[PDB]
């Protein structure tokens, strides 16, 4: 008994309402369908179960509706931290199936990131690598690009970018740039550079160090 | 106090067995159902079947009725998972969790869940990884705080463990998903304090490995030239 | 530890 | 463990019959309840069953929708009520328990109720005449002597035919009812020892319900 | 539904045969699932063998059942008395419970005359005009026995009606009763009422008479 589950992703302001739904290819009794939260790789929760309950310790403004082969959970006021990936699951029978998941991420105010940059250390250096870190935190939308500079000129290779998953919190995305170069190439250039910008502006925030000097 | 405590990340070659863990606390252990369930990364959650608690029966769901073992020791309250022969598709996370109940009749839904077992199938060596310290040049200041970081780079398989301060320090971190860089995992932390705290006060990052047994720490200390 | 023909899990 | 029914019915179509079935000697909403019919010379049919923890039941498909399974819980006791009657409901309806293993069910039924009759009929209720059958001139027949009681002419079944209250029961044949005109007819035979009759009185008593008539008739020789 | 089909209808054996009685289901059912039950001449059927070949409490080592897929079986290793009744299997494989048509054991014993009595109509009845002459044929084997009827020396067939026991449990004989029935006025223009027991395989009847006019 397959369960669709849908939107695949969703995006909600706090305080707005929110409904993703559970659908059967055939009948799931209200008493045995249940729904899970579950953030970024951790164990998932119970949320709701047999329909409409909510388990131990989940707030009031969550709910759950539905009968036959058509069912819901809805938030009433979105918070923060309902930042989740939720799954529906069934019994009518076995196996038990879930859902492929509703990922519900939250809008926030635009922020930009604290920028940070980094030299290779002198323990990397002596093993002949160089990476040069930049972390981009605190920021939103998850949007963002970073152009590095050596030399003042732009370098698009050896370059690696990771992402956090959304803040429970404050809604904000954090990302860390990582260029590696050779210790001999790190060591024929001096100044490096990193540069933030939103995909809507032309103003970048700007961070950088040179080999040289303080 | 419910738990359902799970054996620690496994690394195995192809065609080898796995057998993980899921003990059990706080209730009696043979009135619950156990279930298994599979995450493939970055994937959703897969019934895998249940084992009967009272009875030993395991029941495996279409997916998982060729490798896949069931088993109980009801004197220790633990359950189960074994593979055998292992394909690089059974790398995943493995929960356990136990049946949820009214006050007779199962919900047919899953209550209490392990906290995971991680599996990863491959035929690759362990690599300790290198713990690099990033700070700022010359310790050069960026107003009332101060972002440090950690380097963590080259190392098989996942995961690793990464502390600041022993854990004391636990406001104000991002730590970033591994990526793959020269076929191993890198990842890297940040943690941002008050330009009062440091370098005035102590900040390292710890970083364990259990795969290769390694537990370093690295002192993020302001450094010219 | 049957009740209705629901068995103990 | 047992398994006690309410009494024989006779209703007309149309009508309602509420059987009753009270369970002793077990918790009563541990164990499923089933219903089974019987007509007359036949097999046996599963209706269905309750959960008498729930009250949920669960109906075969030839026993939707005039049928109705009920728990009185407080009461230990399951109903089953049959709603516009047909001729076609004229059967003994059984209650019989589910049958558990230790550790799950079987999908039998290990105790069940004596049954309860049930007659559905426009047919009016007919008393029965009681006559007693002796030998002529109680001419005897060596050293046993057998006596008689004929029923003749009720309607419904069922009668209850004892003798000497039911302190005489060896020796006994009491005759199954055959059906003539619209009306029963029953017979008894109880053989006793010779010198005991007719010294030692023989009676046969015959109740009938239904019409609320009940009857005993002292066996005596008569002559020519 | 998985609907059962019971072999023999009816089985005749003598005490201490080893019989086999069979039920054959539409679809395969589970061999935890199929039962067998008792049933007796005026009784609740009572479960005799749960799963396939577990004995119910109380029932005799002599029972045995064996089966899978869609072909059952119970066996007496040695039949007894006791045992005639109707046997019933049942089935769950999903719902509904079906049963079986039944089984019918039939306990073969030695022959067996009847004792035959006749009875004349009672005083109380003929003064409400009726005539009922009663014949009881007691404890006789084997089952098919014919009764003829001879008022005045002749033959009536009309007005009788015959009704016959369930074999007896304990020493499988049947018995037998037959009721003429005439008005009181054709009852008294006759003398002699004649009762004849014959079994179909015998030329020797077993008779009884009365006369109305005489002891």
């Known amino acids: 008994?397959?369960?669709?589950?849908?939107?695949?992703?969703?995006?909600?302001?706090?305080?707005?309402?929110?409904?993703?739904?559970?659908?059967?290819?055939?009948?799931?009794?209200?008493?045995?369908?249940?729904?899970?939260?579950?953030?970024?790789?951790?164990?998932?929760?119970?949320?709701?179960?047999?329909?409409?309950?909510?388990?131990?310790?989940?707030?009031?403004?969550?709910?759950?509706?539905?009968?036959?082969?058509?069912?819901?959970?809805?938030?009433?006021?979105?918070?923060?931290?309902?930042?989740?990936?939720?799954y529906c699951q069934q019994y009518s029978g076995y196996p038990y199936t879930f859902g492929g998941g509703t990922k519900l991420e939250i809008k926030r105010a635009d922020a930009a990131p604290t920028v940070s940059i980094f030299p290779p250390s002198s323990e990397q250096l002596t093993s002949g690598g160089a990476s040069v870190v930049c972390f981009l935190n605190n920021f939103y939308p998850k949007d963002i690009n970073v152009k590095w500079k050596i030399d003042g000129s732009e370098r698009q290779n050896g370059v690696l970018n990771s992402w956090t998953d959304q803040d429970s919190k404050d809604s904000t995305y954090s990302m860390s740039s990582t260029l590696t170069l050779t210790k001999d190439e790190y060591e024929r250039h001096n100044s490096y550079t990193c540069e933030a910008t939103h995909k809507t502006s032309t103003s970048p925030i700007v961070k950088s160090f040179n080999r040289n000097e303080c | 106090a419910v738990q359902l405590e799970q054996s620690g990340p496994e690394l195995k070659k192809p065609g080898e067995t796995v057998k993980i863990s899921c003990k059990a606390s706080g209730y009696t252990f043979t009135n619950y159902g156990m279930n298994?369930?599979?995450?493939?990364?970055?994937?959703?959650?897969?019934?895998?079947?249940?084992?009967?608690?009272?009875?030993?029966?395991?029941?495996?769901?279409?997916?998982?009725?060729?490798?896949?073992?069931?088993?109980?020791?009801?004197?220790?309250?633990?359950?189960?998972?074994?593979?055998?022969?292992?394909?690089?598709?059974?790398?995943?996370?493995?929960?356990?969790?136990?049946?949820?109940?009214?006050?007779?009749?199962?919900?047919?839904?899953?209550?209490?869940?392990?906290?995971?077992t991680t599996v990863t199938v491959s035929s690759?060596?362990?690599?300790?990884?290198?713990?690099?310290?990033?700070?700022?040049?010359?310790?050069?200041?960026?107003?009332?705080?101060?972002?440090?970081?950690?380097?963590?780079?080259?190392?098989?398989?996942?995961?690793?463990?990464?502390?600041?301060?022993?854990?004391?320090?636990?406001?104000?971190?991002?730590t970033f998903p591994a990526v793959l860089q020269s076929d191993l995992y890198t990842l890297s932390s940040s943690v941002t304090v008050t330009s009062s705290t440091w370098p005035s006060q102590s900040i390292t990052c710890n970083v364990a490995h259990p795969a290769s047994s390694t537990k370093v720490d690295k002192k993020i200390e302001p450094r010219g030239g | 530890?049957?009740?209705?023909?629901?068995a103990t899990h």
């Open chain 1, 1 to 86: 008994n397959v369960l669709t589950q849908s939107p695949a992703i969703m995006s909600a302001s706090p305080g707005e309402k929110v409904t993703m739904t559970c659908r059967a290819s055939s009948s799931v009794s209200s008493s045995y369908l249940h729904w899970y939260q579950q953030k970024s790789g951790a164990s998932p929760k119970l949320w709701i179960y047999s329909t409409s309950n909510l388990a131990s310790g989940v707030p009031a403004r969550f709910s759950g509706s539905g009968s036959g082969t058509s069912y819901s959970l809805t938030i009433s006021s979105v918070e923060a931290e309902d930042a989740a990936t939720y």
């Open chain 2, 36 to 116: 298994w369930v599979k995450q493939a990364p970055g994937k959703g959650l897969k019934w895998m079947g249940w084992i009967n608690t009272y009875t030993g029966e395991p029941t495996y769901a279409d997916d998982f009725k060729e490798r896949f073992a069931f088993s109980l020791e009801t004197s220790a309250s633990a359950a189960y998972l074994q593979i055998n022969n292992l394909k690089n598709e059974d790398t995943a996370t493995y929960f356990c969790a136990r049946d949820y109940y009214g006050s007779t009749y199962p919900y047919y839904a899953m209550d209490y869940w392990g906290q995971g």
């Open chain 2, 124 to 174: 690759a060596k362990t690599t300790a990884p290198s713990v690099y310290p990033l700070a700022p040049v010359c310790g050069d200041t960026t107003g009332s705080s101060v972002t440090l970081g950690c380097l963590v780079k080259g190392y098989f398989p996942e995961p690793v463990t990464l502390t600041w301060n022993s854990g004391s320090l636990s406001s104000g971190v991002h």
């Open chain 3, 1 to 6: 530890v049957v009740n209705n023909k629901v």
